[PDB]
Amino acid sequence: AVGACVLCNSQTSLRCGACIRRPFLCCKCCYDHVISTSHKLVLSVNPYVCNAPGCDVTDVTQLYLGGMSYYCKSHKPPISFPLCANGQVFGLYKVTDFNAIATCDWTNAGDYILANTCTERLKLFAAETLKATEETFKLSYGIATVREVLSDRELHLSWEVGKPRPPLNRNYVFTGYQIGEYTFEKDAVVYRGTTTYKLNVGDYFVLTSHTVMPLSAPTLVPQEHYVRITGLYPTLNISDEFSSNVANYQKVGMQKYSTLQGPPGTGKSHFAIGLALYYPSARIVYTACSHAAVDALCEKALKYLPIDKCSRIIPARARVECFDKFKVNSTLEQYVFCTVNALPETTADIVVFDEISMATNYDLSVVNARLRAKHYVYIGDPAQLPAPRTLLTKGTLEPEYFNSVCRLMKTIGPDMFLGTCRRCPAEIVDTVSALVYDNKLKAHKDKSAQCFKMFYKGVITHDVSSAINRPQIGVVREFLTRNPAWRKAVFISPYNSQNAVASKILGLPTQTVDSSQGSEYDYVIFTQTTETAHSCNVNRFNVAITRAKVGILCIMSDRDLYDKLQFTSLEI
């Protein structure tokens, strides 16, 4: 009840009753808020409501102080002062951006731009408000009750009438009824249960609406620059393998936090694990939002770091299969690998946060609250994919607005840049270098002469809204017959429904662009499927074509991106 103002820290008994997070607002700032927004309910120990019996006046601008109580204009005593006067709301201890964050529905991109260009306390208010809004939106969706169980991987669902049906992709994880978390993929549907249970007919599934906790720590700690390496003890005998990053590892010890921009295959995991070999006494906590990103850091550590000093932290509510080679849940080991949402409350000499474009400001703040470190290293690439913003439907979110770290990398530049792509054939490196890296990404490999492009719009069908292009899959089928080496290719597309159709017709393993991020394959077959802003997104395009080590086949819909591909064009 007695707290600090979210805009100027000035201690106050006032909280806005109309804000979903009920932020503490000082006398001067609370006024500026209520007089310029639909928000008029003000809270204290006792709320600002007319005390006269059965009176429903709750608007602070229509209320007054009758000695030590509150009444409206109809019930106030003769000796009464308005609660709103002289730019203040009467309270104990006597913003255009705050108003927009407090009242927006988070469906426009301009809302996310503001949530990242505002002050640090407003980045936290925006992050809790958004996450709480995203949670109440899960309640709007309809329940799915099991109508029939066909086999061990297929079932038929009955949906709730009057309430919308949530998108059926791996992005939406339901909580089954607690018969474990489950996911669905498209009258025959495919059921993927985290726990193996003999699907009961009648058992219902409801979305994982979790409670949004308040944020205390900033998204980024205030930057500190040092004259020498602080609290970290380096080696002189540092393996030749990691010699390329020695100046960069030293920059890490001479700053509180550092940003590393690493385009695809430039050595991000190698840099992250090599930092442990450079400061061999340093206790390092490796974190990322996804289990896949944490597991990819575990695979690199398994090769260079002693296995007895590693531990993979697994939340007691084990969602998916992850890394099994380190001792599980030993928080005290020198090397701790854990997803952000499972981080224990501990300290470290270095905290490494990978896949930084997938972090939200909420995740950035949680890491600063659960981990107190001498150094923080943020690794990722603002030219790769961001975290999905389920509420955002109007506008495109630019990389400088993904999070605070991405904002820094796109404005003031990253502290460190890994400039040599060692994964991709030169045709792919030269294409993305020009597209998203301002020609600063260099190719280590030669041109493979296995990178093809085909301009073919096909026919766009839809499974609700997820798109399908059967003629583009028909072109791939015709190509596979003529190019049997491509039998081992991974099929990639911007749509789950396109992938479902290609899995049956081609038999190739499938991956969406978003689920392919961080992974690499010898051959990639990409079908653009549509000409939407989603399938044309340059960050998504960049991720899609940089998955390939040897060859890529792109069946394109957009002329712009087709013309930019520095690939050999094919006919049909």
Residue ranges at the known binding site for a ribonucleoside 5'-triphosphate: 262-269
Residue 150 structure tokens: 């066909």
Interaction between residue 122 and Zn ion (CB under 5 A): no
Are the C-beta atoms of residues 428 and 545 closer than 8 Å to each other? yes
Does residue 29 touch Zn ion according to CB under 5 A?
yes
474-503 b/e (C-beta count within 10 Å ≥ 16 → b): bbbeebbeebeebeebbbbbbbbbbbbbbe
Contact between 26 and Zn ion per CB under 5 A: yes
Nearer to Zn ion, 39 or 131 (CB): 39
- Closer residue to Zn ion (CB): 125 or 182: 125
Q: Nearest 5°: phi and psi at 149?
A: -110, 110
One residue of 42, 60, 102, 435 binding Zn ion per CB under 5 A: 102
In terms of CB distance, is 122 or 371 closer to Zn ion? 122
**Which of 50, 272, 284, 428 is the binder for Zn ion (CB under 5 A)?**
50
- Spatial distance between the Cα atoms of 510 and 89, rounded to a whole number of angstroms: 59
Q: Check binding of 75 to Zn ion (CB under 5 A).
A: yes
Task: Tell me the window of 26-34, 151-159, 194-202, 395-403 that interacts with Zn ion (CB under 5 A).
Answer: 26-34
Under a CB-based contact definition with an 8 Å cutoff, are residues 277 and 306 in contact?
no
Q: Which is nearer to Zn ion, 94 or 210 (CB)?
A: 94
Residue recorded with tokens 């005593």? 77
Piece in contact with Zn ion (CB under 5 A), picked from 86-94, 97-105, 134-142, 436-444: 97-105
Min dist CB 38 to Zn ion, Å, is 9
Q: Using the rule CB under 5 A, is 39 a contact of Zn ion?
A: yes
Question: Binder to Zn ion among 57, 122, 336, 525 (CB under 5 A)?
Answer: 57
Which residue ranges are tagged as binding site? 5, 8, 16, 19, 26, 29, 33, 39, 50, 55, 72, 75, 262-269
The least CB distance from residue 125 to Zn ion, in Å, is: 10
Residue closer to Zn ion by CB (options 65, 143) is 65
52 belongs to the binding site for Zn ion (CB under 5 A): yes
Does residue 256 bind Zn ion (CB under 5 A)?
no
| Under rule CB under 5 A, residue 8 binds Zn ion | yes
Stretch that binds Zn ion, among 50-58, 108-116, 289-297, 461-469 (CB under 5 A): 50-58
Interface residue with Zn ion among 14, 18, 220, 436 (CB under 5 A) is 18
Strands annotated E in 389-464: 416-417, 420-421, 442-443, 451-455, 461-463
Near Zn ion by CB under 5 A, which window of 67-75, 196-204, 364-372, 489-497?
67-75
Scanning 95-103, 230-238, 287-295, 374-382 for contacts with Zn ion by CB under 5 A, the matching segment is: 95-103
C-beta neighbour count of 514 within 10 angstroms: 18
Distances in Å between the Cα of 333 and the Cα atoms of 228, 286, 288, 471 are 27, 12, 18, 53
Supply the minimum distance, in Å, between the C-beta of residue 422 and Zn ion.
51
CB 427 within 8 A of CB 550: no
Asked if residues 277 and 242 have their Cβ atoms less than 8 Å apart, the reply is yes
Does the protein bind Zn ion through residue 16 (CB under 5 A)?
A: yes
Minimum CB–partner distance for residue 521 and Zn ion (Å): 49
Compute the least distance from the CB of residue 56 to Zn ion, in Å.
Answer: 8
**What are the distances in angstroms from CA 114 to CA 98, 365, 375?**
9, 17, 28
Alpha-carbon span 153 to 156, nearest angstrom: 11
Q: What long-range pairs does 467-470 form, CB within 8 A, spacing at least 24?
A: 467/494, 467/495, 467/497, 467/498, 467/529, 467/530, 467/532, 467/535, 468/495, 468/497, 468/498, 468/501, 468/529, 469/498, 469/527, 469/528, 469/529, 469/530, 469/557, 470/501, 470/505
37 token code pair: 């927004």
**Residue 220 touching Zn ion (CB under 5 A):** no
Least distance to Zn ion from the beta carbon of 430, Å?
51
> Cα–Cα distance between 112 and 101 in angstroms, integer?
9
In Å, how far are 105, 216, 516, 559 from 30, measured between CA atoms?
A: 21, 21, 47, 52
Query: At its nearest, how many Å lie between Zn ion and the CB of residue 103?
Result: 7
Which residues form the interface with Zn ion (CB under 5 A)? 5, 7-8, 10, 16, 18-19, 26, 29, 39, 50, 52, 55, 57, 72, 74-75, 102
